[PDB]
Amino acid sequence: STDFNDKILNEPLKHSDFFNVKELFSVRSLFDARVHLGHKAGCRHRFMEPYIFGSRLDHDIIDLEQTATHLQLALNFTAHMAYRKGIILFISRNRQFSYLIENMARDCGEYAHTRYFRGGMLTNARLLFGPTVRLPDLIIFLHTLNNIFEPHVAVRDAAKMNIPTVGIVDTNCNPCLITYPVPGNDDSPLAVHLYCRLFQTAITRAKEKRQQVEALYRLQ
């Protein structure tokens, strides 16, 4: 058990990019997906200024260099969690992409909550689901805002319950409590599809690498 854990769990933590997530994307791919388009300058959020490249005719432009760095970190974290077999829950209240996100979750073997987030799903989880339920080990927000342009209550609840949160934060979002913010465009279908594909690929790579490493260790 000791050696197994030491060589399985802690081995990947010794490498900058163990799962090679940087190859999954490039600044050009994000640009082509339009990850760099934000809302009007009037909708801008005070905490999203550091990630905004500028304002092109009252339209904010998200610094895709910072997006690339943040996306690297978020994808690496997600890959490591999937490798460690944690529960990854995808949250998004964008009804335009509810179906897509649910399908991505089902395909990648993780969970999704794209519906009306009932109060207490995380803070009252033991009562709602059962005393032995296992809460998600990572929450990935494809849209950190609810359908009234307020932060998803899941963000606050995840911070409360100490569940790390990856999250795509647009120029009108509040990245303060999101553990791994990925400044980007969460409203374009192209951008949302790119995010879904990236997270799906990273999680699948992590799971398959976990299986491969386990087989390598157990066969010897």
Partner: protein
């Protein structure tokens, strides 16, 4: 002297006009039934945010 026999035309006009008034009440009610309820639903969908978030 309130003899309807020779006031028939005016009396028929009055009766028809009253019937038309009731019909107009009915049609106006059904027509009334943007509505404040729908407009309040729309405003709820896009509420005023006088605070920060």
């Amino acid at each position: 002297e309130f003899r309807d026999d020779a006031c028939r035309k005016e009396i028929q006009g009055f009766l028809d006009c009253a019937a038309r008034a009731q019909e107009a009440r009915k049609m106006r009610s059904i027509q009334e039934t943007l509505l404040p309820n729908k407009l309040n639903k729309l405003l709820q969908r896009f509420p005023n945010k006088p605070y920060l978030s």
